[PDB]
Design a protein around this ligand. Structure first.
Ligand SMILES: OC[C@H]1O[C@@H](O[C@H]2[C@H](O)[C@@H](O)[C@H](O)O[C@@H]2CO)[C@H](O)[C@@H](O)[C@H]1O
Ligand SMILES: OC[C@H]1O[C@@H](O[C@H]2[C@H](O)[C@@H](O)[C@H](O)O[C@@H]2CO)[C@H](O)[C@@H](O)[C@H]1O
Ligand SMILES: [Cl-]
Ligand SMILES: [Cl-]
Ligand SMILES: [Cl-]
Lengths: 150, 149
């Protein structure tokens, strides 16, 4: 059911999501971490404004320093909320990945390389998300959606 | 019989509490028969048993028998149905017995009937929210049991 919106995008990438993130929607992102990455992020946004910065419903932020971790959070009206830090991370420098974000009624579920990684409860209604951004030190092969509606 | 909380010949419609969480690898095993004149039946994995307002249905597994037959799968959230996922390759038949095995995975249900893979259904509600098994419609149930993880 997977409809890619882009292949091999320049980073940072900001694109419109062409349908609503209804429960059962999948987001699939394939890419590769450069050898000298410190971090990258996948942001599910309400719009693409820079000034002031668009709300980030779901900020998914792998960080590579020390033992590595993933930080998840939400940006509302240019303020970050409570960090949810996952210390069990599958990402590594100079390694390829496939991220699958499953949109559920109450939360996102993320799996990497076919293995569950983390959950993150909705803080912004997922119906408000219309934009996906990818930022930081990462190579992206593809970004696709499997919409519930299709 | 390694199954757990086995019930025979429940009264239909059946609404029962699932006796443990639907963790990955959990099985729900339902043996029964399709009446000769069935239109449809359903197996519903529900968040509670409220009738009004109607409990959320994480997984509605709905064999339909008109025309060439099919299985409709869907989810009910806050009393509204989502987009149907229709399986046209259906193993069910009027007057035929079945054994349904629902395997719960972290990201989907995997359903087999009489030992044959039937369909996949990706989660729309987290399966940890499911505490209730409903069986409704034109169907005969011989047994229900579970294999937990
Ligand atoms: O919360 C996501 C957000 O983190 C910012 O950095 C935080 C940092 O994670 C924390 O350990 C420190 O105590 O506060 C910092 C200031 O906000 C990042 O700057 C931002 O890009 C997001 O990743
Ligand atoms: O989707 C499950 C749901 O279907 C309802 O019937 C649908 C029907 O399948 C569809 O063809 C039509 O467009 O809308 C009907 C109402 O949503 C059933 O009423 C319900 O019991 C479930 O089986
Ligand atoms: Cl940021
Ligand atoms: Cl949920
Ligand atoms: Cl119904």
């Amino acid at each position: 059911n997977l409809q890619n919106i882009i292949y091999n995008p320049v980073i940072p990438f900001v694109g419109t999501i062409p349908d609503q993130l209804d429960p059962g929607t999948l987001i699939v992102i394939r890419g590769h971490v450069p050898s000298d990455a410190d971090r990258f992020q996948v942001d599910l946004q309400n719009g693409s404004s820079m000034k002031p910065r668009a709300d980030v419903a779901f900020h998914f932020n792998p960080r590579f320093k020390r033992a590595g971790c993933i930080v998840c959070n939400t940006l509302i009206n240019e303020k970050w909320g409570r960090e949810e830090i996952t210390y069990d991370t599958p990402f590594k420098r100079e390694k390829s990945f496939e991220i699958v974000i499953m949109v559920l009624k109450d939360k996102f579920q993320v799996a990497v390389n076919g293995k569950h990684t983390l959950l993150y409860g909705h803080r912004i209604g997922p119906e408000k998300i219309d934009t996906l951004g990818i930022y930081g030190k990462v190579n992206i092969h593809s970004i696709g959606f499997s919409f519930s509606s299709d």
